[PDB]
Amino acid sequence: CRATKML
Amino acid sequence: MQFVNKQFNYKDPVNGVDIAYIKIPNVGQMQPVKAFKIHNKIWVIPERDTFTNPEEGDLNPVPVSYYDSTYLSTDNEKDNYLKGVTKLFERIYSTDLGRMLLTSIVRGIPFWGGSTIDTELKVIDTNCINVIQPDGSYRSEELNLVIIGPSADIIQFECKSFGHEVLNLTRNGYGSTQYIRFSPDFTFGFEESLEVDTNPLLGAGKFATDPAVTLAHELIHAGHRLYGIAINPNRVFKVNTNAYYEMSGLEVSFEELRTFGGHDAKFIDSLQENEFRLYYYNKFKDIASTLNKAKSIVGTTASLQYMKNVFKEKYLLSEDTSGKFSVDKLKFDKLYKMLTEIYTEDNFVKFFKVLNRKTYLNFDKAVFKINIVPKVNYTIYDGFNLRNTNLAANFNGQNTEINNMNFTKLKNFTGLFEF
Ligand SMILES: [Zn+2]
Numbered sequence A: 001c002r003a004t005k006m007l
Numbered sequence B: 001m002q003f004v005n006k007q008f009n010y011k012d013p014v015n016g017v018d019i020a021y022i023k024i025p026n027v028g029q030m031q032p033v034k035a036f037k038i039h040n041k042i043w044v045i046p047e048r049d050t051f052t053n054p055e056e057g058d059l060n061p062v063p064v065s066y067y068d069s070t071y072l073s074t075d076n077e078k079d080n081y082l083k084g085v086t087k088l089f090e091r092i093y094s095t096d097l098g099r100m101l102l103t104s105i106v107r108g109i110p111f112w113g114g115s116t117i118d119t120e121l122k123v124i125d126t127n128c129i130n131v132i133q134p135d136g137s138y139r140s141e142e143l144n145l146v147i148i149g150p151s152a153d154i155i156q157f158e159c160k161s162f163g164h165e166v167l168n169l170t171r172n173g174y175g176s177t178q179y180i181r182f183s184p185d186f187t188f189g190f191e192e193s194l195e196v197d198t199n200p201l202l203g204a205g206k207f208a209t210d211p212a213v214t215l216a217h218e219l220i221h222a223g224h225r226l227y228g229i230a231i232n233p234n235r236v237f238k239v240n241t242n243a244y245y246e247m248s249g250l251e252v253s254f255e256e257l258r259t260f261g262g263h264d265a266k267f268i269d270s271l272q273e274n275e276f277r278l279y280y281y282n283k284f285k286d287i288a289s290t291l292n293k294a295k296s297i298v299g300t301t302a303s304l305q306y307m308k309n310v311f312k313e314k315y316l317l318s319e320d321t322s323g324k325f326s327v328d329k330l331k332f333d334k335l336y337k338m339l340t341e342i343y344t345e346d347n348f349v350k351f352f353k354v355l356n357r358k359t360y361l362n363f364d365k366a367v368f369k370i371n372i373v374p375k376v377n378y379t380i381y382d383g384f385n386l387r388n389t390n391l392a393a394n395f396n397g398q399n400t401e402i403n404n405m406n407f408t409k410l411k412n413f414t415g416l417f418e419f
Helices: B075-093 B096-107 B211-226 B243-248 B254-260 B262-267 B270-293 B304-315 B329-342 B345-352
Strands: B019-023 B033-039 B042-048 B128-132 B138-142 B145-149 B158-160 B178-181 B186-190 B236-238 B251-253 B366-369 B408-412
Touching: B033 B075, B042 B075, B075 B096, B075 B211, B096 B211, B096 B329, B096 B345, B158 B211, B178 B211, B186 B211, B211 B254, B211 B329, B211 B345, B236 B254, B251 B254, B254 B262, B254 B345, B262 B345, B270 B304, B270 B329
Parallel strands: B042 B145, B145 B178
Antiparallel strands: B019 B033, B019 B128, B033 B042, B128 B138, B158 B178, B186 B366, B236 B251, B366 B408
């Protein structure tokens, strides 16, 4: 699970 | 004491009880899949998830992603997946924190809120699976959690669930059965220096994340969602403590910051914390009100008084003489705090005694292929950092340079971000 999924 | 009483083999014969062909309540047709019931209310499906989302039905092909349509296709792979996931549940359960989370998960039965007549209590069918019995006919079984393999992107792990037409089950206190896309067969590389780990241009991923942490992260989301207290994904933090995040306009959901914990959770300010706590307190009051209105139960498997007790125990409700339920604010605040502040990625790291990312506000470095099944590689008690060896000290087992036989780098991400 990672923040950059939202890019 | 173990969380998983049977050490299933993938090729073990079906019995229609804890080894069975099942269907999940997705919209559209699917063929049954073989599944394994590792604990009360918890099943494992060793298949790629081509089922939960209609737009995600195939396995062909973003900076941080990894594709291989053949992964998890063979029996040996599915056997190793089952053993890997089992070993990680045991590693979690062997900690006091993980025993507490897993107990909360098992107790977190999705609310029986499926009736449109308020004098009647009824299950919601999407919080069940259909299980093929020995006679070939289906029965409906309630469950709280399914661990399934990833969809097309092998390294996109996530805790998801079936919606309701009208109700927001993960946000209204009711809860819903949670499906976690997860693999024990891969892990992520990170950097030991904060300033390197949080920079998209630096580091090759010297240390490997312990997959127990990664699974725990998804289980913490599942706890939020089973208790119907997830923060709406549209509530986000405009990151302003990382120049690279700001150039990209990268926002991070409050739900992630909470789940990570530590300093990350403190980006949610006090006003907003109080707002969410009041919001979910009001949801739990709605549940008490709903239970008080219900004078009958629908179906024949469980009595009304048993199901009222299940939800008394789940929500820690108070029951007076009439048998009337209310929410005690102190008990609510305590349970809410447990689920949201005690069960965090940062706290798991402390219990496992592993090295891990220090913040969710970082940049991934690499993906590695791993095999945690052999005890010579990874154990319940020590993960990669095997006691009484060269790997015990200084997280040497997580050091992909020192413990190189345990990791094969599949892909670098550094430099792939648009920076
Ligand atoms: Zn997450």
